[PDB]
Design a binder for these strands. Structure first.
Lengths: 353, 143, 132, 94, 228, 50, 107, 55
RNA sequence: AACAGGUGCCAGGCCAACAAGAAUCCGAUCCGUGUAUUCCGUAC
RNA sequence: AGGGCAUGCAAUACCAAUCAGAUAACAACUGAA
RNA sequence: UGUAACGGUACAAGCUGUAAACAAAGG
RNA sequence: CGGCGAGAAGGGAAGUGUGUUUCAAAGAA
RNA sequence: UGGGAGCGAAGAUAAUCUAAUAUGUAACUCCGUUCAUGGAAAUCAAAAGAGCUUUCACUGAUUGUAUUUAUGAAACGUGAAAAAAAAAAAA
RNA sequence: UUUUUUUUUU
């Protein structure tokens, strides 16, 4: 046992704060709306939430809801990488923990080189993998008081669902009434709100996901369910779209229950994939390449290289293992020789191409 | 049924049902088998614990008591005018010196047949005896 | 050495030259610690200090004694100047403040008097003058 | 095995006894402090010795002899101009 | 080293609460006697109730001195004199378990803390201090602090500090056994009553036959005859 | 049910007495009481004939 | 008795100061521009100024009274008196004094 | 089907909800006596991070 | 193990605030919880 | 615990790089615990 | 917390802390 | 009277013949 | 405290002597013990399959290191005790 | 076939 380093980190659960007595301000201090902490008038000063602006600048962000058990420096690099997409990041600052300098409190500041570049990062939130506790980041603009959309994902899900249901209803209607006009059939469709289920006219989910009625039909799974036909068979605003729709007839496709179900199911996976891809963009888009050295450097920030075997050899216990064994060395020599033969096969393809 | 009723009431355990027990009881009664030892023992055990629904911690009767234990006061419940029987006038004779002739008698084919009986009949006999030997004292007002 | 390191126990610090980490330190709350000497009492040091002396601006709120009569000319001049050049209450120190910055960062011309009004220092002023 | 980056490849999947009875004079060359898990030294805590610290080594001749000796790291004196601090820092052991 | 095993084995005995329960069987003997008893010293200072002397009451405001909770204030919930321990809300939470009721899947509970690890805060000063009792002419008892010399506030009502103990409930549920089967759990009073009725006839029947439609009668119980 | 039995069973919830744990066996010696123990105080001797 | 009112007063003042600071920052952010919002904020800040000053006026008496025994009193000391009911205090650490060279003289 | 369940086995089959066959579904299953239900056709596959890198 | 203490030395029935014999015979001085016989209380 | 309770055990550590003392302007100045 | 010195007590391997073997009665 | 949503990183280790097996350096009582 | 980390010699055995055992043992400094240590696989196995960590028994004084003297709770595997993947976007 | 777990009614 000895003094731990930065590798060792501990964190316990936090019990929610409940005021049992309202008239006892001594034993049950009132919470603060800014610092989210007990009001300490005796030793703490009142805050305003705009102190970082005078420090950094107007063109700044207030990121919150950070994970635990991660170094501030690692978080800074991660954040810089993330934020670099929009524009040139000036500086990233992280507030250490009160009781743990090697740990993050849960708040950070980001500075941009430009106003418009900063503005673009406020739109959507930040989603983290399982590695980071799946902690969703909350942003705020100090210059504009603009916040991010935290409910984007959950609202999209309901859209997906509504699409599914509208498809089903359309199919049913078609079945029950034969072919119907394009402009007339659509009126028999409804959707539901995300916050609380309430019947509403369809089209919000269509515009959200698909973006257009035409597109809805032109989709991959959707096209196998329905068929549009031009008036002779028997870059567009809302009015033009409507006018085009006014002279078309919808025809269903004869399908079985199992097939129908399968298709319906597939649609959802596709839609979900879409959503995921929207939130999982790369960090190296519209950027020049990087040297291998740089790549290595990047790698180092996450993962360490293996130890040389030369050194590792010494680790062998003399009790049960021979330090320097000729057969053991010969085996490693043969493995090293086989490595080049393996590499040549991969290298030959580039010359062939 | 007797073997299974004693098992726990967990997932990984086979246990019969109350209606199954009644159906089996009727089926056995029909064939003049209502007086079954195993059936009676299973029936008593089933209701001993509400068909396994009730559960209590493991309980072991005490076989010894500590010195200077607690004292509990209680009056006699036996009806008045009742006392234990007294022994014979002084003592019995010696076992080896006097009781040497009366302890031995000639054997008979009936004795041989009685000795050649199985264990199940003995066990049944015992059970029946204990069953039959269940009585209590009456009260003046009870009569 | 007997046991090898791992992904969690490969970084260590010196016994004396180290960084306190109560959050990440072995402890036994359920055990008596004679090392801390729970019997021995300790004084109460001042929370705010200015030029090595108790902060005069924190007196009205936190209270405490003032060693005005022990000040020298050098100290007293600056002290006087401080109380004359538009003093601010946020200049005082804080005991375990929130991780976020303090209002002292800006120190701009405000439209109000934080904590106390300027009229609550004549008592101290008198003493200051006397000392002068 | 696990933790390949660290020393002791051939020591993890062995008996407890082996581990307990492992000797230190069986290794000729030095081992990196980061890999070995050695505690930082006072001289290192007062300077910037990124991967450098006091180590130990052992000798061996034809006569099956063995010894152990101490070895000091390599340290230099320099000067660095810090723009943020706005003050020179003379005599920095690096 | 070739002594670790034995060392540990020996050491274990200290912690061992010998003798332990042991059910008997057929042709089997106990081994508890063969277990050496732990070693202990008798001559030592007598215990003391620090709670009593420190004038520390349930519901009082305390602050954590050491441990993970370097600075954290709370309210005393429970005091144990024999262990010289206190329980403070929102501090020292390490005991986790499965949810025995409605809610999440895991629930934690606060753990006791040594009295020596905590101190009473000053009313006005809000710093660790001491409290002394003083009796008036009328017999009225007043608690006065050292630093400020001010009167202490009254304790919080027990009705407000009363909370349910889910750890105990989980232990009680575990003591019984695994969860019951769905099939078995279902009630059946209709057949249970028939089985209960047959149980009395089997037990207190004295071997008498059961009633029948043609012969709805049963022999009466026989009393215990005295030895004339 | 018997009236007497009812009466008797009435007192089932009465307090019980102390009892030993399951499989309680008293430890007893084999060897004699006489043995040299010269590493004991003056007032703690047991030698009579050995 | 007095402590309790002090507490509440303090709390209220604490809240009001944060609101006033937020309004002043919002006013400062839009200096080179004129609008109705700015006027609105000025009005609200004006209101809060009085709303806060009253609190301090009410608070003044209590703070003094509360902080009674905090400071030493020679009168209550065992050195200068012998009457029942003594008072003791703990020595502080003043760097300004500790860093100075002084002889152990008493006159 | 002919398995002699031991203490160890019985414990698992009686405690762990994953062994509960009365509520078995091929699309939603636990992993090892877990409380939370995982998506077998979804949870078994990798995913990309905010950075677009594999996870 | 009625080692639970005391009473002049070995006490279930004597003092010990709640059950139960100043029990009979024997005894060198010499009380004597001692030998022999017998009764009673006990969820102690 | 109503009340009272001299003196000594070198004590700003209920906190905070290391190195004498009432715990040291930089540098000189060094270190296996 | 544990201990050493001085004083008192009957100068003591106990007790005790100049209030140094006690307040027991607040209308 | 079961028929191409037929996929999950391109990287580590194993025989040195690997069309073979396994795994993911990267998360909490 | 025969627990963990740094450093760490000799008397003694080999009937003197080198390696080796003693022993990573003794002295010195530090952590202060189940609210601990440890840890949920780029592991083991080889063509079957096991499934974080930890304690006991057997395999077995077998394999291995040594040799003139010893040392060695080895790995796979079996039995048994205790059983634990993650509470979790915010209000 | 040579066995076996007692409460009904907190």
């Amino acid at each position: 046992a000895c003094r731990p380093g930065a590798t060792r980190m501990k964190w316990y659960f936090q019990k929610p704060y409940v005021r049992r007595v309202k008239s006892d301000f001594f034993r049950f201090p009132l919470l603060s709306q800014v610092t989210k902490q007990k009001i300490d008038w005796q030793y703490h000063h009142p805050r305003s939430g705009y102190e970082a602006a005078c420090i950094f600048g107007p063109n700044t962000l207030e990121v919150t809801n950070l994970p635990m058990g991660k170094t501030c420096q690692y978080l800074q690099e991660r954040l810089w990488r993330f934020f670099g997409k929009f524009g040139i990041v000036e500086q990233v600052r992280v507030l250490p923990h009160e009781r743990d300098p090697y740990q993050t409190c849960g708040t950070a500041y980001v500075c941009f080189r430009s106003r418009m570049a900063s503005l673009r990062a406020v739109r959507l939130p930040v989603h983290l993998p399982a590695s980071l506790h799946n902690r969703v980041l909350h942003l705020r603009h100090l210059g504009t008081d603009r916040t991010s959309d935290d409910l984007f994902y959950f609202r999209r899900q309901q859209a997906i669902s509504n699409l599914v249901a509208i498809a089903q209803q359309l199919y049913a209607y078609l079945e029950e009434r034969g072919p119907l006009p394009a402009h007339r059939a659509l009126r028999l469709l409804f959707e539901r709100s995300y916050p609380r289920l309430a019947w509403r006219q369809a089209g919000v989910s269509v515009r959200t996901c698909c973006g257009s009625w035409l597109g809805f039909f032109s989709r991959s799974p959707f096209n196998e369910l329905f068929y549009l036909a031009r008036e002779d068979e028997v870059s567009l605003t809302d009015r033009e779209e409507n006018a085009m729709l006014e002279k078309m007839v919808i025809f269903p496709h004869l399908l079985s229950r199992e097939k129908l179900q399968a298709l319906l199911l597939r649609a959802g996976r596709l839609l979900q994939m879409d959503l995921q891809n929207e939130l999982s963009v790369h960090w190296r888009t519209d950027r020049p390449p990087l040297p291998d050295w740089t790549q290595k450097q990047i790698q180092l920030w996450q993962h360490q290289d293996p130890l040389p075997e030369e050194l590792q050899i010494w680790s062998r216990t003399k009790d049960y293992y021979k330090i320097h064994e000729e057969r053991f060395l010969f085996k490693l020599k043969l493995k090293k020789e086989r490595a080049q033969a393996k590499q040549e096969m991969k290298q030959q393809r580039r010359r062939l191409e | 049924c007797r073997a299974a009723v004693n098992r726990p009431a967990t997932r990984s355990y086979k246990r019969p049902l109350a209606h199954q027990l009644v159906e089996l009881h009727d089926l056995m009664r029909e064939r003049n088998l209502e007086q079954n030892k195993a059936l009676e023992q299973a029936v008593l055990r089933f209701v001993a614990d509400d068909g396994g629904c009730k559960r209590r911690p493991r309980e072991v009767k005490p076989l010894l008591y500590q010195r200077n234990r607690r004292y509990i006061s209680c009056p006699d419940l036996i009806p008045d005018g009742i006392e234990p029987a007294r022994p014979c006038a002084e003592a019995l004779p010696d076992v080896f010196m006097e009781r040497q002739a009366s302890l031995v008698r000639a054997c008979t084919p009936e004795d041989l047949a009685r000795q050649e009986l199985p264990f199940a009949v003995q066990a049944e006999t015992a059970y029946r005896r204990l069953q039959r030997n269940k009585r209590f004292l009456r009260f003046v007002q009870e009569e | 050495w007997y046991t090898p390191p791992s992904k969690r126990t490969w970084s260590k610090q010196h016994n004396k030259i180290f960084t306190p980490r109560p959050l990440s330190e072995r402890f036994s709350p359920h055990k008596l610690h004679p090392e801390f000497e729970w019997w021995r009492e300790r004084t109460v040091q001042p929370s705010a200090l200015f030029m090595g002396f108790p902060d005069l601006l924190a007196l009205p709120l936190r209270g405490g004694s003032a060693y005005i009569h022990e000040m020298d000319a050098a100290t007293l001049a600056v002290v006087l100047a401080s109380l004359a050049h538009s003093p601010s209450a946020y200049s005082v120190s804080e005991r375990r403040p929130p991780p976020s910055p303090s209002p002292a960062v800006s120190l701009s011309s405000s439209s109000f008097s934080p904590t106390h009004l300027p009229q609550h220092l004549d008592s101290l002023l008198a003493l200051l003058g006397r000392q002068a | 095995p696990k933790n390949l980056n660290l020393w002791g490849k051939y020591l993890r999947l062995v008996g407890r006894g082996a581990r307990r009875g492992f000797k230190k004079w069986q290794v000729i060359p030095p081992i990196p402090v980061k890999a070995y898990g050695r505690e930082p030294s006072a001289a290192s805590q007062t300077g910037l010795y990124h991967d450098e610290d006091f180590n130990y080594h052992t000798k061996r001749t034809f006569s099956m002899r063995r010894t152990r000796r101490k070895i000091k790291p390599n340290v230099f004196r320099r000067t660095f101009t810090s723009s943020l601090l706005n003050v020179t820092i003379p005599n920095v052991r690096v | 080293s070739r002594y670790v095993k034995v060392y540990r084995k020996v050491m274990n005995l200290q912690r061992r609460k010998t003798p332990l329960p042991w059910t008997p069987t057929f042709l089997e003997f106990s081994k508890e006697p063969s277990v050496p008893f732990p070693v202990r010293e008798k001559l030592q200072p007598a215990p003391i109730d620090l709670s009593y002397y420190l004038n520390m009451e349930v519901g009082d405001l305390v602050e954590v001195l050491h441990g993970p909770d370097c600075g954290r204030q709370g309210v005393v919930l429970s005091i144990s004199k024999k262990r010289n321990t206190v329980v403070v809300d929102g501090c020292n939470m390490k005991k986790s378990f499965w949810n025995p009721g409605v809610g999440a899947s895991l629930i934690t509970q606060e753990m006791p803390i040594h009295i020596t690890n905590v101190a009473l805060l000053d009313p006005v000063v809000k710093r660790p201090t001491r409290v002394k009792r003083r009796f008036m002419m009328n017999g009225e008892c007043v608690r006065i602090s050292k630093l400020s010399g001010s009167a202490m506030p009254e304790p919080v009502s027990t009705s407000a500090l009363r909370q349910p103990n889910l750890y105990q409930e989980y232990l009680r549920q575990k003591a019984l056994g695994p969860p019951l089967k769905a099939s078995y759990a279902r009630p059946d009073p209709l057949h249970l009553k028939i089985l209960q009725r047959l149980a009395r006839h089997i037990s207190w029947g004295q071997g008498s036959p059961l009633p029948t439609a043609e012969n709805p009668r049963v022999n009466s119980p026989e009393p215990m005859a005295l030895r004339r | 049910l018997p009236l007497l039995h009812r009466l008797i069973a009435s007192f089932k919830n009465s307090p019980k007495m102390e009892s030993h744990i399951e499989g309680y066996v008293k430890k007893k010696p084999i060897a004699g009481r006489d043995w040299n123990n010269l590493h004991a105080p003056r007032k703690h001797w047991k030698k009579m004939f050995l | 008795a007095k402590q309790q009112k002090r507490e509440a007063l303090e709390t209220r003042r604490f809240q009001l100061e944060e609101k006033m600071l937020q309004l002043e920052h919002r006013i400062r952010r839009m200096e080179p521009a004129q609008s109705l919002q700015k006027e609105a904020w000025q009005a609200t800040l004006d209101r809060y100024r009085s709303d806060h000053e009253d609190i301090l006026i009410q608070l003044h008496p209590l703070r003094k009274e509360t902080t009674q025994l905090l400071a030493p009193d020679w009168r209550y000391e065992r050195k200068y008196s012998d009457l029942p009911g003594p008072i003791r205090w703990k020595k502080q650490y003043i760097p300004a004094l500790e860093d100075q060279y002084r002889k152990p003289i008493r006159f | 089907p002919f398995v002699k369940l031991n203490k160890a086995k019985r414990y698992v089959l009686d405690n762990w909800p994953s062994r509960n066959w009365d509520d078995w579904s091929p699309y939603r299953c636990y992993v090892r006596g877990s409380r939370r239900r995982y998506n077998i056709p979804q949870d078994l596959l990798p995913y990309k991070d905010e950075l677009g890198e594999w996870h």
